Amino acid sequence: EMSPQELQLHYFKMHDYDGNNLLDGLELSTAITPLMSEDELINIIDGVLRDDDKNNDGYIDYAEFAKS
Template sequence: MAANILVVSCLILGSFAHQPQQFPGSNQQQPQQGGQAEQAQHAQPGQQQFGGEQARDEHHIKEHLDGKVDPTANMTPEQLQFHYFNMHDLDKNGKLDGVELIKAITHFHAENPGPQHTQNNANANHQPPPLPSEVELETMIDSILKDDDFNADGFIDYGEFLKAQKLREDQARSHQEQMQKAGGTQ
């Protein structure tokens, strides 16, 4: 008797195991194989199998991973610089123009408020700092192009970007060394 119950239980479990999984609120169908096509025809409208096209929808997956996965976690400093440059190259032509530079400046400005706009400041009303005026932005862009556009074509290409970054790093290092020497001689 126990053997019969065991055999019947295995048959029932086996039949459930071969049926496609259905999830409430879903309406997409998985590719069907063999006898599953007939079962899919009897599925209730508005139901979908787990995965399907959503499992291959890159945009949908990225939405759910936002803030959970850091794509830059294992990047080298050089890769991070390349990523930063490409992030601001909106038209993907390999060059930053004035509009893209303005976008980069305003993006940086919004994420790096001055001390008068930090949360530690009691007078701060948690508002982002005001953006630079048009005249200030124009002055900044002119300065960037004057200093970093080495071939004077009106754009900053990746090679110019790297060269300018290296020059700034060298200047900062030199300034820091001078400050340390000046501090040690007093």
């Protein structure tokens, strides 16, 4: 099995479908998804960007994802 660090990178790249080592809101959508209302989907993704995305570029990189 994986170390805690190897597990973090693993779940970071799990929805990095374009392989650019950055998580965008659409890639998050796919992670988050009968179906929830589109308003609750926006609220969640928005919350994640507001919490994780420090340089406000609409992406979450590994550093932002991990914290430490």
